[PDB]
Design a protein around this ligand. Structure first.
Ligand SMILES: NC(=O)c1ccc[n+]([C@@H]2O[C@H](COP(=O)([O-])OP(=O)(O)OC[C@H]3O[C@@H](n4cnc5c(N)ncnc54)[C@H](O)[C@@H]3O)[C@@H](O)[C@H]2O)c1
Ligand SMILES: NC(=O)c1ccc[n+]([C@@H]2O[C@H](COP(=O)([O-])OP(=O)(O)OC[C@H]3O[C@@H](n4cnc5c(N)ncnc54)[C@H](O)[C@@H]3O)[C@@H](O)[C@H]2O)c1
Lengths: 662, 657
């Protein structure tokens, strides 16, 4: 608690450089492209026998007593080999076994490194501690200690254990410890050597547990020396030695390709408080990831703008989608009021609403922030966002859909189609209108053209939506052809051929072995991060949770005793109606063809029928409980133009008769 | 016609085709695309330019086959003597030209390759990609590796002229090849890491290619049998001899000579390409069930992982076989969306006939026995058309269902011997009133399941622990706020430290990603369990109940009287199947409120239908002797269900109605 503030004090103290390091690392963490090269120090915390202690065992067994001290890199690798060569190989394995067979505990740092959502973890350790913490937390990684495993992996995420491991047996052949092990590494570990390097090239590397004079750190530095300048992202280093890095050192290693983050300088601790140093440099990143470090109105404005700007390409956003956009930090209700939800940090949305309420506070902001605030205000007013539920009141709700297709303006749609397009969005709307009028070959051609142009235009959204709509158009064409060939000729009295053989053959040939499941995955990770809410558009079926939620309308105990638990003092009727309206508006305003499928019609029918049945039952129970004059002819369900058109479009004669007689 | 080709395909060919297809359905195939593919699109073959340099340098063509040396030297002699400008001039002239995406390009992208490494300077693979609508990050220069934005890559290992038709952006002359790893260290490694972790299928190269031969000399060094032998799609007119087939096969390759697959004239290239490319590999994407033993092996492969569980819902089986057949609640099997050999019908025929079972070879009768036992226990009887007199029975062996609390206490007290006993003990503790002990035991099981296993018990323990934590949180919420008034005292079932610890431990846990984070092998083997992590477990049954309620109430209003089987039997069958599945697998989902509501609705509809069918014996039997006898009557299981899943208000309402 007090330290929490001290962590923030450290955070305040962080020079721009440490903040930048933390910044890129935290962004990388989120992108899914961080890797941690975890060395020995992170396990000396768990007391895993340090190496000098084993090099020392060998010195004492070999010659007779411990060395002077300061084993260099050479002695680190040669005393093990001398013993191996002179005292034996089966003894070498016994010394190892005695020290390394001891099961140690798992440190706090092991879960922090894993808390940052590391894409992979490279490690020059034989211990199975990263590999146990992984399991405790549930993070499944593919451990690669041996060459044989490089190809027999399962996940793309990896626990690359360079320098082997004792999973197969405590023998110095299953690990890299002595001089020859390190000398012939490339020859004896070709695939693991490469896997480490490709990962270093692509993902961001944050070293933790190594010295700057470590053998491995300086080996990688010589490889990176070869790499082309700016062909690689510089790796970060976490120096947890117990003192400030001599500025000279900082520079040399900085130029060699490191970006040190000395903990000794970021906090103050005793000479032997190694864990403290780790936690300091490690916590700044963890908290920073959570965006807990934020105080200014400009900061929350920038955060919300960065989160919201990509959605401007759309026309309407469902209230449920906003929950996923903000990562469950807030609940977005159909009523338009938003509430806090598992948010441990600054109330940025509270600040945004407070700014909206008061003009002077808005004037306090800068000019660019003022423009961003204006844009966000416009977007929120369009999508229907109100202040917090605490500050709520007699909020109203009206349904309005801006779409010529919904209102059946066939003449206006044809006139628009006949016009000359000016933008790709106009082409998308034209294709949707063509599909709505039954002209499906023209819609397919226009969607193909839009797909061809968007990829070059860098319009990922239109590209994705056009691909989905083209697939749906192809499916509709296929089912229509099957129906016409199966029964169309009989009922019509004559065989009808709306589509020529050449077009059918061409579409069959072009869309062969097509898979809509992998469409979203292949898009760049930037798009997947910005527009994740659209993933559900690629699923085979949807609107299942909404259908399941209809059970509440079938409840009977509510009439005897109802608490209005749904939302805040709202019945399930209003919630379901607003959910249906939101779904309808989102589908119709975004020009999506999925409206024309059986599932949507069935969902609409079920919702409307259950709502009307609940209204009738409520009226009957009200009449029964009180006198007949009380609600004798009261109508618990009120209809409007939108309900009329919905019923007309989505109900059959049998459904209407069943509703009327029910 | 390809049927004959298929028939002819030797075991070798079909084995190659099998692995290539299967790797693709997993997402691990990679195509090494060479020059030939682009010559199908009449792109200047290299020797055309080697010969252009050999003419502007010397004065004529080499009138001979360019060796591996002259391919790389003639370009360099010209560069060293005629300069960079002209070198790049001929480059612009021959290569600044548009050519069409040949058919083989699309075939390749139809295999949905994970990556496409290529030694081509052209952009034909890239165009086919955009046209197909398949994205790939193109890496053709060192810098591109660090700035890529996708997992998939179009690694152009010899550069491309996308940055201009200069020779500085490509590998063609000799110095470029000699200093390759020095100049392209990142792309060199990337290719090699993919080769190691993906199945490579070369296409567009000859066995004597410089590149093919260099890769093979590196695989020699791998020297740990840690590499998947790369397939090589030969497509030269003549048939590959045997001496070479042996030598190059030993050197690391798996040749698939198209000449052997299909006969052709000396210059029929797109023909040899297509046959091996799609008319075989792509056309063989399906199964090859043609023997009495392959049926048993396939069924055992699809059914073995389910042995870890105790019972399987019949409806869920629809997803096990990928919609190949419809499984009905009454135990009947119907064909649906299956165009290949009928293997379940063959299995049923073998079950009926003992001689067919005797025909099975050794080591396969035990698998048939296990499958027969599993199907008999699950209740699958036979195919629909051969249906006999189906029967209905109820049997739940779960101890907690019958409310034998003392027996569960004794079981908990007794020592455990296997993690299954620990799971049962955790379920018993949850059903007895110990949330802390159940949580601790679930955590213990999660910790101790590190050893090799199917990963099922670990996943179920995680889900159960999450649900138990949710129940603990709700209990605390209604204790600290309402427990004071309910009992008049501040009841403290759990200490603050335990609550804080459990809150801290899973503050980052997200049930949504629990299934995705599991190994890929588990996902393709135990996919049915995914629905256990959301309300999708109870979607189809609820819709069916709604439809049946609507139909039954419509018939009630009409007043018709059928003389056949009751139309609400499916509701009872689904209800009992769901109860058995949830109770025999020791799952906490039995405690959910939506499950209680569904049970209440189903039994209320059943009771209403029974009450209506009770009174019909006075109208239909009063005007004519013709009538019916079938009905519904109370029993122990229904009594327990009602006592557990109904409130006093619902029972009073049913009594009134
Ligand atoms: N060969 C030797 O130099 C030698 C000989 C005898 C004793 N020691 C002892 O070993 C200790 C560490 O030296 P080293 O061999 O690891 O090389 P080192 O000090 O270069 O270690 C590099 C990294 O290991 C981490 N680390 C070191 N000791 C740690 C600890 N106790 N807990 C957590 N992290 C730790 C540090 O954060 C550092 O970043 C020294 O304090 C020294 O007393 C070293
Ligand atoms: N040796 C030369 O440099 C040279 C000189 C002049 C003419 N040619 C002519 O060019 C042809 C191929 O020359 P190469 O040295 O590249 O052969 P190659 O064997 O090196 O070709 C490599 C791969 O490309 C394939 N391939 C060859 N021609 C193809 C085509 N037109 N379409 C599709 N795939 C094709 C081959 O089957 C082989 O698998 C020869 O038939 C020859 O008549 C070659």
């Amino acid at each position: 608690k007090r330290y929490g503030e001290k962590l923030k004090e450290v955070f305040l103290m962080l020079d721009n450089n440490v903040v930048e390091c933390i910044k890129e690392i935290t962004e990388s963490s989120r992108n899914g492209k961080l890797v941690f090269f975890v060395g020995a120090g992170v396990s000396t915390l768990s007391d895993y026998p340090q190496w000098w202690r084993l090099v020392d065992k060998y010195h004492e067994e070999l010659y007779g007593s411990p060395k002077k001290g300061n084993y260099s890199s050479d002695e680190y690798l040669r005393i093990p080999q001398i013993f191996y060569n002179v005292k034996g190989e089966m003894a070498f394995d016994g010394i190892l076994k005695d020290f390394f067979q001891v099961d140690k505990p798992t440190n706090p740092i092991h879960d922090k490194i894993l808390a940052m959502n590391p894409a992979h973890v490279i490690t020059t350790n034989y211990d199975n501690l990263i590999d146990t913490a992984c399991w405790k937390r549930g993070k499944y990684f593919s451990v690669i200690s041996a060459e044989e495993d490089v190809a027999n992996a399962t996940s793309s995420r990896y626990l690359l254990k360079v320098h082997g491991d004792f999973r197969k047996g405590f023998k110095g052949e299953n690990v890299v410890l002595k001089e020859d092990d390190y000398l012939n590494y490339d020859q004896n570990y070709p695939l693991i050597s490469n896997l480490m390097k490709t990962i270093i090239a692509t993902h961001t590397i944050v070293f933790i547990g190594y010295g700057l004079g470590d053998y491995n750190i300086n080996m990688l530095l010589n490889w990176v020396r070869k790499l082309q300048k700016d062909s690689f992202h510089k790796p970060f280093f976490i120096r947890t030695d117990p003192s400030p890095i001599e500025n000279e050192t900082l520079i040399y290693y900085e130029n060699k390709g490191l970006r040190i983050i000395d903990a000794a300088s970021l906090i103050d601790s005793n000479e032997y408080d190694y864990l403290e140093r780790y936690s300091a440099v490690m916590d700044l990143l963890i908290e920073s990831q959570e965006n807990k470090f934020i105080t200014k109105d400009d900061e929350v404005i920038d955060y919300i703008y960065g989160k919201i700007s990509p959605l401007f390409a759309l026309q309407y956003i469902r209230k449920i989608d906003l929950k996923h956009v903000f990562e469950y930090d807030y609940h977005f209700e159909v009523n338009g009021t938003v509430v806090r939800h598992k948010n441990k940090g600054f109330g940025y949305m509270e600040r945004f609403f407070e700014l909206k309420e008061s003009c002077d506070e808005r004037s306090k902001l800068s000019k660019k922030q003022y423009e961003r605030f204006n844009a966000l205000f416009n977007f929120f007013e369009k999508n229907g966002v109100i202040c917090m539920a605490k500050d709520a009141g007699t909020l109203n709700t009206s349904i309005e859909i801006n779409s010529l297709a919904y209102h059946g303006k066939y003449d206006v749609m044809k006139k628009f189609i006949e016009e000359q397009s000016v933008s790709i969005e106009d082409d998308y709307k034209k294709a949707f209108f063509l599909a709505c009028l039954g002209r499906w070959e023209e819609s397919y051609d226009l969607y193909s053209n839009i797909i061809l142009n968007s990829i070059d235009e860098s319009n990922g959204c239109v590209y994705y939506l056009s691909q989905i709509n083209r697939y749906r158009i192809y499916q509709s064409i296929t089912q229509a052809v099957t129906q016409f060939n199966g029964l169309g000729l009989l009922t019509f009295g004559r065989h009808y051929k709306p589509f020529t053989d050449e077009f059918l053959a061409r579409i069959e040939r072009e869309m062969t072995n097509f898979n809509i499941d992998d469409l979203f995955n292949g898009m760049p990770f930037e798009f997947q991060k910005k527009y994740k809410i659209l993933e559900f558009l690629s699923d085979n079926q949807f609107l299942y949770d909404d259908t399941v939620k209809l059970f509440e309308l079938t409840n009977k105990v509510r009439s005897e005793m109802s608490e209005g638990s749904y939302s805040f003092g709202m019945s399930s009727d209003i919630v379901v109606l607003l959910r249906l309206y939101d779904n309808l508006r989102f589908l119709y305003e975004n020009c999506l063809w999925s409206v024309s499928f059986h599932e949507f019609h069935q969902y609409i029918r079920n919702s409307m029928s259950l709502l009307i049945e609940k209204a009738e039952y409520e009226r009957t129970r009200d009449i029964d409980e009180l006198g007949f004059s009380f609600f004798g002819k009261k109508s618990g369900f009120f209809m409007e133009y939108y309900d009329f058109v919905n019923i007309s479009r989505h109900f059959k004669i049998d459904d209407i008769k069943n509703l009327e007689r029910s």
